[PDB]
Paper text:
The xylan-specific α-glucuronidases from glycoside hydrolase family 115 ([name]) specifically catalyse the removal of α-d-glucuronic acid (GlcA) or methylated GlcA (MeGlcA). In this study, we report crystal structures of a bacterial [name] ortholog (wtsAgu115A) identified in a metagenome from an anaerobic digester fed with wastewater treatment sludge.
Three Ca2+ ions were modelled in wtsAgu115A [name] in the unbound form.
Numbering used by the authors:
A (entry chain A), B (entry chain A): 0 to 300, 319 to 838
The structure:
């Protein structure tokens, strides 16, 4: 985490041994230490168990000659080292959330050598403990993304003095929100509770602390953090998480505490229900009195009368705080949120009391609305920013996957920090998963925005990947995380549909093929992993990539189906099938995530519907098959194709004729897939005469064109029946025709054998061209005919060329066309 | 194989039980049966072992009341059933290679019920036995492609009478050729022999017989089938394989028998060394006297004197055959090959004796050169066709993978059969692997070409896939086999290079992305397989697909590297890296095939070099890295980009400026990957004034253009500093400029909030356009400048539009450009 390259997998005299032949060195702690530090030290002890197979013993007396000595500045053992100048206590005293990690010789009598982890306060000590956890190899995501722990037999750590200094943002954390159906289902499946209890939140707290955050807004759609379980707040307070509430939840009451008793409580109008709402406020403050939770103040129900009533609500709330806490209101931390109604009041002069944090919000889509000017930056209480990775509302909700590329988060948050907003940073994380990477980035940036610039963003992603998957996997894993996040930034999954990208220009095909290419790369990486890494890889990379590449292909296929159905081309049916198959594959992938991956550990987390949005909300029953169209009796829907020119050319796959007239006995037969592109078409069988047979093609050409060059691509058939060679006649109906002999020189005569013969047969095709004058027509429509004059001619592709011809192995993209009857 | 849907996985009173609760029914055979039939029956007995865990007992007396009774028409038990009209003996007597498979009640006294497998001759009986093998689920490829056998506890087979009738081609088989280094290395690794001995060939024979072929040309570059091991011919003769030799190996002597003693033997000129060469011929015929091998006749060293000497050689060879065999020469089967020199002699009238098969050849690339006319079809000896899946020679060798799509094989071989060529079909198969599928198709077609037409080719591929991988895998496995074979038909791997496909038109990207998409589909299928199917899938599908998709991407990357290096664009370095990585991946894939897959069983088979061809032959040391180019000091090779218009537009990724002038303090900073396409560029940090800063772009426009529409795409930044909004100035240097305010209406005012505000911020970008008159310039070069007037403007993309603009999510493909200094 903080300090890279200081822990080694083998021992050394000038390094400090953390683990030797499977035996961990013991951890010394003051048995009366802050309990949250003790919990973290117990987690560290188990972290040594995950590494080596045996927990590091947690002792209360220096029984041993080598020790890991942990604690706060005021615990008995740490206090003794600072007093004896064995540790630079000045670097910690008065500092916020800071640790000092260093090896010292003879720290205590009877102890020869120790690693010291001293915190300026309880969170500083917890953070230093979790730094050691990451050194020995336990990712913050070891539980919440199943990131396995590499087993070890020996670990040593370099001497030196290490710290993360102080955090740059005072309160750094997350907001569980948009939490139904995913997080709520997962909690009910895991804990049996239709609410979040202290078991669930304890698990959330440990993750936030390991990530070095300190702050949480709890889930509140249909839950109440404070009311549902009395141990919720007690656990948060003990463990070291600062709790808060969102914008319109004043005075440490969760919204649902009012809603669940809306009939008993009244109006929520401060003018009529004033003493009912005052008592509401008071009870809340009483619940939190000796915790350090952040208190939202204010309220949302003429302009000057509104500004006055809000002024009264606030100073009323602050006398209630004074009353309950028994000390002046500024001794309790407070936050006041700017929303639309009160944004006007602010610009007219309205400010909270100056010790109060003023919380700003982004636009629900990751862009900051408003930042302090140089005159407003003065505000002694400072400023907050609320940022979205997930949103329910306009113009359409995004509830499914990560949509927040790393560049976007950084670009707006670096602006936020440079304008002086550094008291509170809190991110809407949805159900938490699958926002694991943007959460890590956002908290790391809140710790020290200074270490992030444009040139080094991806270094962060790389270190993240090396932590989750090992050095040897990190470059490629980070590349894929960065690139899929970028793709998801182009358009949310919920707003992606058949019309998002340009079909005719090739843009749709490009972005669909490129997402599938990303999937192929993720699959190759997946196959190189050890089995114990697969679930973490699926959660962090493979499922978002596979689900998005499948979703892109579904809508790309739908647009392809609609285009071909309009054109009356039976190929629409193939694309209808692909829409069905990909749509079902979406259900297969999320079934795997919920039920099979990690033995169903995350069942519930991936139940959000995403296919079938018609408005902004997800109030449709389930994932729904995108509408598709089918051509009845397709194998009889042939011929009748008419082409329009495009870019100085008409390019024609040979089976898309207008009409075909057969021979006596021999019939035009298309050979599916044959040749370089669509197919081949030939008179079958090769034993009958071809007299009178023909293929004809209908095409529109701009009347400005007076002569064309016709290219005809056929299979490199050799002259098996007659060494004169095969000929066919080619020309426009009512105009000039020429006869082409395409293989007279495909033989082993000395002048042919290597100059032409072996070159064209190894290529498998023959291209010939004639130049034909274009006679005048009233409508611009022409009929090109192909009359074979020998048996066995396999026609494949035609291009009539009047400027736009491009040399190419496939003979160019087919021009626009339609089918008739 | 022959009869589908007649074997069931559970028992039934009206079906015949082959396997019951793990116990197989016994196989009755005449203990004095033809030994090759006995070997096949022993293989059938072991096939029941692979299915159920216990071999079917092979007995010589009807000890049991239910039996599988097998044998030739003249074996004692079969002979008794035909005599008692229990079997329709008339349907078999006189017939060639035909079996009858049918359930009969009370076949023999003491036997209540039996499945009878009666052959018209030894191969007919062997074929009927192997039909039952496929019914119970043992693929012909169970050994040669590790196709696993589904375990069973119960099998029953429907009553009825089943046959494959008689084969349509008399001799059907393969030619091991181009066999070094792959097949030779695999044989040395597996058998320790620098030659093919009877252990190796016995394994080849069993495969050919299970595939229902009967013919082999043995490996002969540096081996001698007849001379290297005396059991080679004896095993072929016993087992039932007809042996032959290639065109210029007359009289059952392999070429190397002459070459290894070229100093002792002389000239190989029938005029000078006549009695030395006569004795050569005689010894050969003596070796084969009572086998049924096919004898090549003729010889290759004025025109009328040549036709006379060849006439003399032939009738000389035929008196030698008469002498050795003691019977007239026509009682020994003979074949005479047409090659170039003697093609003239044929058209002047020269024919072999009329009992001799006249062997024709394709062009070494799968196209038939010459077929009999209606007058020549008369030839009583009939005709052969030699067909290539592999070739060493012009214009360049193809030695690595399958290059023969199913459509091409069928289209030429159906022609071959319809013109009366049906005595000998033999395919050059290289090292045999990896031609497994075209071999199966080619032999199946030789058996009965009648059942193949254009509409049903892929049904064959589907049945093949269902046999190797199960019903549930068959559609998808066949789809991939068909599509990769088609791709390999476009250009051989050896002739593919950076120049094969069109780069500028998008064709190269298309075919590279589509091969990778095929790989992604193969990988998804691979993950659904049972572990015991993985090696067969890798051999038949995953390795050819992965190796080709990697090879395509390597050369596509090389062409991309060369284009960007020419343009002096540092992005060439990324593509240089991809060439290196893909080139090494080619070595990783074949290492896996040789050393890891199937525990190294096939080590040697995939050692052919394929990257580095400069001429027709593979006489370079090893796979060699394609040449790539790198730009030194790349992160300082920025700016200086000049664009040329294309298709009525100039499309510009914002970081490709010509020059950038910074502000006081704030500097132009590109944010890699940010936005929808290449990147974003912005003045950093957002706290300093932007006065005087600019980005300028140089572009050439046709002088016919008099006004343009300029689109500028920026990030949807909101007016955080000033609700007036952000502005930038945009215009041409020396011409008109306009000022754009791009976010004045991005707010929650009632007229903005849902009409524009939430729509554009959810899209993350803002596009604005101005219309600017185009002033005259002598050279057609223009400079467009972008001057930001507020902090925090994130520029992303520009398009100057004069006709060619297309609405698109990515704002079109960047126009041609170069970098300067
Ligand atoms: Ca969600
Ligand atoms: Ca501050
Ligand atoms: Ca679903
Ligand atoms: Ca080979
Ligand atoms: Ca015949
Ligand atoms: Ca190699």
């Amino acid at each position: 985490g903080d300090n890279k390259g200081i822990t080694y997998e083998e021992l050394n005299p000038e390094r400090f041994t953390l683990l030797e032949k499977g035996t961990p060195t013991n951890i010394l702690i003051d048995e009366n230490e802050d309990q949250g530090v003790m919990i973290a030290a117990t987690n560290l002890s188990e972290d040594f168990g995950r590494v080596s197979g045996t927990n590091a013993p947690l002792i209360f007396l220096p029984d041993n000659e080598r020790l890991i000595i942990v604690g706060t500045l005021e615990s008995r053992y740490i206090k003794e080292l600072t007093e004896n100048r064995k540790i630079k206590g000045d670097e910690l005293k008065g500092k916020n959330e800071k640790y000092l990690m260093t090896v010292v010789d003879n720290p205590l009598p009877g102890v020869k050598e120790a690693l010291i982890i001293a915190g300026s306060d309880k969170r500083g000590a917890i953070y230093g403990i979790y730094e050691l956890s990451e050194q020995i190899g336990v990712s913050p995501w070891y539980d919440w993304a199943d990131v396995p722990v590499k087993p070890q037999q020996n670990l040593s750590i370099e001497r030196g003095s290490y710290t993360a200094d102080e955090p740059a943002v005072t309160y750094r954390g997350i907001f569980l929100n948009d939490e139904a159906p995913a997080l709520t289902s997962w909690v009910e499946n895991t804990y049996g509770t239709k609410y979040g209890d202290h078991r669930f939140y304890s698990r959330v707290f440990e993750l936030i602390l390991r990530l070095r955050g300190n702050f949480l807004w709890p889930a509140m759609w249909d839950w109440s953090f404070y009311g549902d379980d009395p141990l919720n707040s007690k656990t948060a307070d003990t463990m070291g998480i600062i709790m808060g509430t969102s914008h319109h939840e004043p005075m440490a009451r969760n919204h649902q505490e009012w809603a669940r008793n809306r009939d008993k409580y009244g109006v929520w109008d401060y003018t009529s229900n004033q003493e009912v709402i005052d008592q509401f406020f008071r009870e809340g403050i009483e619940r939190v009195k000796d915790t350090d939770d952040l208190i939202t103040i204010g309220m949302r129900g003429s302009d000057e009368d509104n500004m006055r009533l809000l002024e009264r609500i606030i100073k009323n709330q602050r006398e209630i705080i004074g009353d309950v806490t028994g000390e002046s209101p500024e001794k309790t931390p407070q936050v006041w949120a700017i929303y639309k109604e009160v944004q006007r009041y602010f610009d007219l002069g309205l400010r909270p009391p100056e010790d109060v944090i003023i919380l700003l919000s982004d636009d629900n889509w990751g862009n900051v609305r408003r930042l302090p000017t140089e005159e407003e930056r003065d505000h002694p209480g400072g400023w907050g920013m609320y940022y979205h990775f997930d949103y329910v509302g306009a113009p359409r909700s995004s509830k499914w996957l990560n949509i927040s590329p790393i560049q976007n988060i950084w670009e707006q948050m670096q602006l936020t920090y440079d304008y002086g907003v550094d008291e509170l940073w809190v991110a809407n994380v949805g159900d938490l998963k699958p926002m694991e990477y943007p959460i890590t980035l956002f908290l790391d940036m809140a710790w020290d925005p200074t270490r992030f610039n444009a040139e080094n963003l991806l270094d962060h992603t790389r270190s993240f990947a090396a932590q989750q998957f090992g050095e040897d996997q990190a470059d490629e894993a980070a590349r894929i995380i960065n690139l899929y996040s970028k793709y998801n930034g182009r358009v949310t999954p919920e707003m992606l549909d058949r019309n998002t990208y340009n079909l005719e220009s090739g843009e749709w095909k490009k972005v669909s093929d490129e997402y599938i290419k990303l999937e192929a790369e993720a699959l190759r990486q997946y196959l190189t992993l050890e089995p114990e890494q697969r679930d973490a890889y699926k959660q962090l990379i493979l499922y978002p990539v596979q689900a998005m590449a499948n979703l892109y292909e579904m809508y790309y296929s739908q647009a392809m189906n609609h285009k071909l159905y309009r054109e009356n081309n039976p190929m629409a049916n193939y694309w209808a099938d692909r829409v069905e198959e990909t749509f079902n594959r979406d259900a297969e992938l999320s079934h795997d995530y919920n039920k099979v991956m990690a033995n169903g550990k995350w069942d519930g987390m991936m139940t959000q519907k995403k296919i079938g949005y018609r408005s902004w909300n997800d109030n449709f029953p389930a994932d729904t098959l995108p509408q598709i169209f089918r051509i009845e009796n397709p194998e009889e829907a042939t011929g009748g194709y008419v082409f329009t020119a495009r870019d100085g050319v008409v390019v024609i796959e040979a089976e898309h004729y207008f009409e075909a007239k057969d021979a006596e006995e021999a019939k035009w037969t298309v050979i599916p897939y044959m040749g370089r592109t669509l197919s081949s078409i030939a008179l079958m069988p090769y034993t009958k005469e071809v007299e009178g047979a023909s293929l004809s093609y209908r095409m529109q050409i701009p009347d400005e064109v007076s002569e064309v060059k016709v290219h005809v691509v056929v299979k490199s058939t050799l002259p098996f029946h007659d060494p004169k060679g095969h000929e066919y006649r080619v020309g426009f109906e009512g105009g000039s025709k020429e006869i082409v002999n395409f293989n007279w020189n495909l033989n082993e005569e000395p002048e042919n054998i290597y100059s032409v013969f072996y070159p064209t047969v190894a290529s498998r095709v023959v291209k010939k061209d004639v130049t034909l004058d274009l006679h005048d027509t009233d409508d611009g429509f022409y009929t090109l005919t192909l009359e074979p004059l020998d048996p066995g001619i396999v026609f494949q592709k035609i291009v009539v060329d009047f400027g736009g011809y491009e040399e190419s192995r496939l003979f160019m993209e087919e021009s626009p066309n339609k089918r008739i009857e």
